[PDB]
Design an enzyme around this catalytic site. Structure first.
Site, short mmCIF file in Angstrom:
data_model
loop_
_atom_site.label_atom_id
_atom_site.label_comp_id
_atom_site.label_asym_id
_atom_site.label_seq_id
_atom_site.Cartn_x
_atom_site.Cartn_y
_atom_site.Cartn_z
N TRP C 11 -19.79 32.04 -4.06
CA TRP C 11 -19.69 31.68 -2.71
C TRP C 11 -19.12 32.82 -1.88
O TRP C 11 -19.90 33.00 -0.43
CB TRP C 11 -18.76 30.50 -2.47
CG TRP C 11 -19.16 29.36 -2.93
CD1 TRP C 11 -20.39 29.09 -3.89
CD2 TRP C 11 -18.61 27.78 -2.88
NE1 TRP C 11 -20.15 27.67 -4.33
CE2 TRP C 11 -19.21 27.13 -3.99
CE3 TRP C 11 -17.35 27.51 -1.93
CZ2 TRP C 11 -18.90 25.90 -4.05
CZ3 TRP C 11 -17.20 26.08 -2.21
CH2 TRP C 11 -17.78 25.49 -3.30
N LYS C 12 -18.41 33.51 -2.27
CA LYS C 12 -17.74 34.77 -1.56
C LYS C 12 -16.76 34.25 -0.51
O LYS C 12 -16.26 33.08 -0.66
CB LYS C 12 -18.70 35.69 -0.84
CG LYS C 12 -19.72 36.19 -1.87
CD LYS C 12 -20.55 37.58 -1.29
CE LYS C 12 -21.44 37.87 -2.54
NZ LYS C 12 -22.15 39.18 -2.05
N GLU C 168 -25.93 43.71 -11.23
CA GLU C 168 -26.22 43.49 -9.74
C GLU C 168 -26.35 44.78 -9.07
O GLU C 168 -25.52 45.53 -8.42
CB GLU C 168 -25.05 42.85 -9.17
CG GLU C 168 -25.37 42.17 -7.93
CD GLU C 168 -23.98 41.46 -7.34
OE1 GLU C 168 -22.95 41.98 -6.93
OE2 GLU C 168 -23.99 40.32 -7.80
N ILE C 173 -28.00 44.03 -2.73
CA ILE C 173 -27.12 43.09 -2.42
C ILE C 173 -27.09 42.78 -0.88
O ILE C 173 -26.63 43.33 -0.27
CB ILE C 173 -25.62 43.66 -2.91
CG1 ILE C 173 -25.60 43.79 -4.51
CG2 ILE C 173 -24.57 42.58 -2.43
CD1 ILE C 173 -24.12 44.04 -4.96
N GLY C 174 -27.64 41.63 -0.63
CA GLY C 174 -27.78 41.00 0.71
C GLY C 174 -28.63 41.87 1.66
O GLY C 174 -28.86 41.77 2.95
N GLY C 235 -25.56 34.71 -5.02
CA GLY C 235 -24.75 34.96 -3.75
C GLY C 235 -25.07 33.82 -2.67
O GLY C 235 -24.49 32.75 -2.92
N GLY C 236 -25.71 34.18 -1.78
CA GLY C 236 -26.11 33.19 -0.61
C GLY C 236 -26.59 32.01 -0.86
O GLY C 236 -25.88 30.81 -0.82
#
Lengths: 252, 255, 255, 252
Positions: C11-12, C168, C173-174, C235-236
């Site tokens: 979730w971060k 990763e 990333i993002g 992630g998201g």
């Protein structure tokens, strides 16, 4: 391979007075050199004075460091121009001492490799793992990173000019030399890697010398190995032991 | 109190043994009768020995742009105090902004070079100065104090007097943005009060504090006049003959 | 060889105890019969205890986003393994890019957290990955090898099997720039050959290696299919219900 | 000055189980507090559970750290939002441990001060010199730099809300407390400086507490001093000794 090199790195050691005498001693004892090259690297202060004693002679002039700019506001630094005008042919870059004590990073180093080549000089790129790195099993990736970072942006033709010097940090001044078996294994590795980045041709052109506790009673056995094209002498380059080494170097 | 003014030229990374030998001789004759203060030239290591002989016996003094703190050892690319002392170097710039910023040279590193230079009977020229951001946060005085305290740490009244400080506001290095004589003087006065508490009145009055922003031949008069500015650490202008001009100006403030 | 696939959600820094309690219950029921693999949710410390009870006895597992390597002490702002073990955390992400890049977390620091997590009977999820520049210099493999060797250093065959790696690629990333299943697989295969030399065949086959670029509900099928990709570190997508989608996809690759 | 504070920083020490009991013990023994504030700072894990036991009570909730973003991809970090929703009023920022072990720099710290104020919480900015710094005579400039960097960009009105905590690094967990004379000298200095940045008004509004080896047999003598507005308790905040301290704190 193809034209071995016996390079002496005095480091921070001689006064212009002593240099003049010592260099002369060498130039007298080695005016006759069976093609294998002999480079001497005195500190900046004594470069021009040593330049004379060497001008026209066989032994060639080497410097211990250089900045990557022809000129500018960088108090304390020496430019490639200043080295060239004195007739310096080789320049050591990335020496462990500089990386570690003076915090020079790979980019910094890489920008120096080019600069040295621009003015048509030969850069001696230093690489090597620390004991801790060697124990964790990072010997190769460490050498690989340094080499890749060092050559990044060089074309087959420039890369051919570059000289590599493997000085295992765990063997610099510690007096603990790597066995010829250990030296060759890394040298070989560097050669294979060198070709994978370019081609078997360039890889065979690039000279890779061993550095680190090179004494007269162990040089033979290191130069004998297949992929070791000479040595970067530290301490031994200060005394006359640099002659006995050059003598052995002639045994091939 | 008297204090001998000082005009120093930090060539930085700029001349070759040839250009150097020329410029130096030129000066050896231009500033020949000048003996009321000290003119210091600081060429790159490569060209010290040459310039060195062009000065042997003359008035102008030799200075280096950096030094390592050891006498000799496994330190590739470094110059030792002994190497400089042989050539006859008298001044050594230590702690210059470029070295602090670009070559990550820290205070403790610089403190050792200061003591080292002093051991061989040479003169350290400790450079201190704030950043634009630092001055904007009002950190000018603490940035300077930290650097002065660090640099002098370990030295005593005697050794302290031999040190020469040079206030060189970083936001005025090669940016042309020289400092108003107000600003310069303000800081120089502080550094001197500080030096007073650290040691004593006598000492703080013996230590020369030079300015170093963008000393040009025109503005230089408005600085050396100030109360707490004993000279200048010149960059660019030390290259051209304008240096010989500045040297002239400084002469018209002594008797 | 068998290996249990794993779908983990990082979730971060995103949910509050409320939003958390909701989302979690939703899942506890959606993925109720799912027992052929492990779904792991990783909420922020603040919201672990709450989510913790919404899972007590359910299938979905609890995971933290970071840990310190000590049990207790003078370390303001840090969470200990004991604090996580009480709440019933089973997985701990260790060495995430954000922590390595933004919070200067180094290899030796990360190695200690790996051993630490293992000591309390929890599962480390070591993250490794190259940078765009790194991949452009051909340093992908040595960057990954260094991180794997460092992270595993000191562990043995037994402890090594319990570790879970997560490749990763930082340049994915993002940034949306997910990695082609070719790229993913290539690296995962390497990390597994490496793990083989480091320990042995048996071990390298027990260690799950998850992917972590920009796992979306559409592309995820083209990755879990690959030979050396045992799951995903999401992630998201672990935020929305799309997470429940991914969980669905993964189920259609087991029997 | 104006409303002292007894703040306890548990650091990395309690399990949700223990917290619940312990907090309750405090809330029972101190439900009656003569206006001087009492803050307790448990680790993130136990925040919400402690929030309950405290909700509506006098003792207030404090956190040990926070990030400066409401949300984003910062694995492992906690946002101001997450702290607020739990009812955390105070947040410790710039603690020596964070600066030193976790390498948090002044900018990082400064960006956290604002973030904590945005969500209307009170930040506890930590400052203090190391033994070495104190010996070189940098005690004041070190505190001055941290304070200036900490308040940079804050207006008279926000700055009034900020809380300062002077924890001389040479006295954290070393058991070596600074004499009240040494504590006051720095506290005073901070107050003068605080006014020079703003005005005598703000300077008197801002509370500055002492931190570092605050034990029950030395708290009196520290709170007694003019410019010490309370303490940031470390170890002593874990046991019941936090009550004896709160007891003494009531002696004024």
């Amino acid at each position: 391979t193809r034209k071995l090199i016996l390079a002496g790195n005095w480091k921070m050691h001689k006064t212009i007075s002593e240099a003049k005498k010592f260099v002369s001693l060498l130039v007298n004892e080695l005016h006759d050199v069976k093609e294998f090259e002999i480079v001497v690297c005195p500190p900046f202060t004594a470069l021009s004075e040593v330049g004379e004693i060497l001008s026209g002679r066989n032994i060639k002039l080497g410097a211990q460091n250089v900045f990557y700019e022809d000129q500018g506001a960088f108090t304390g630094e020496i430019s490639p121009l200043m080295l060239q005008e004195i007739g310096v042919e080789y320049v050591i870059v990335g020496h462990s001492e500089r990386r570690r004590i003076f915090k020079e990073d790979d980019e910094f180093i890489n920008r120096k490799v080019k600069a040295v080549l621009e003015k048509g000089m030969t850069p001696i790129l230093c690489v090597g793992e620390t004991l801790e790195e060697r124990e964790k099993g990072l010997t190769f990736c460490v050498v690989e990173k340094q080499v890749r970072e060092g050559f990044y942006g060089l074309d087959k033709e420039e890369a051919k000019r570059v000289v590599i010097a493997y000085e295992p940090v765990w063997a610099i001044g510690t007096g603990r030399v790597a066995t010829p078996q250990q030296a060759q294994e890394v040298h070989a590795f560097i050669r294979k890697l060198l070709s994978e980045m370019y081609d078997e041709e360039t890889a065979g052109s690039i000279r890779i010398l061993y550095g680190g506790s090179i004494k007269p009673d162990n040089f033979l056995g290191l130069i004998v190995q297949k992929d070791i094209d000479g040595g970067l002498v530290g301490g031994a380059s200060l005394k006359e032991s640099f002659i006995e080494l050059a003598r052995i170097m002639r045994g091939v």
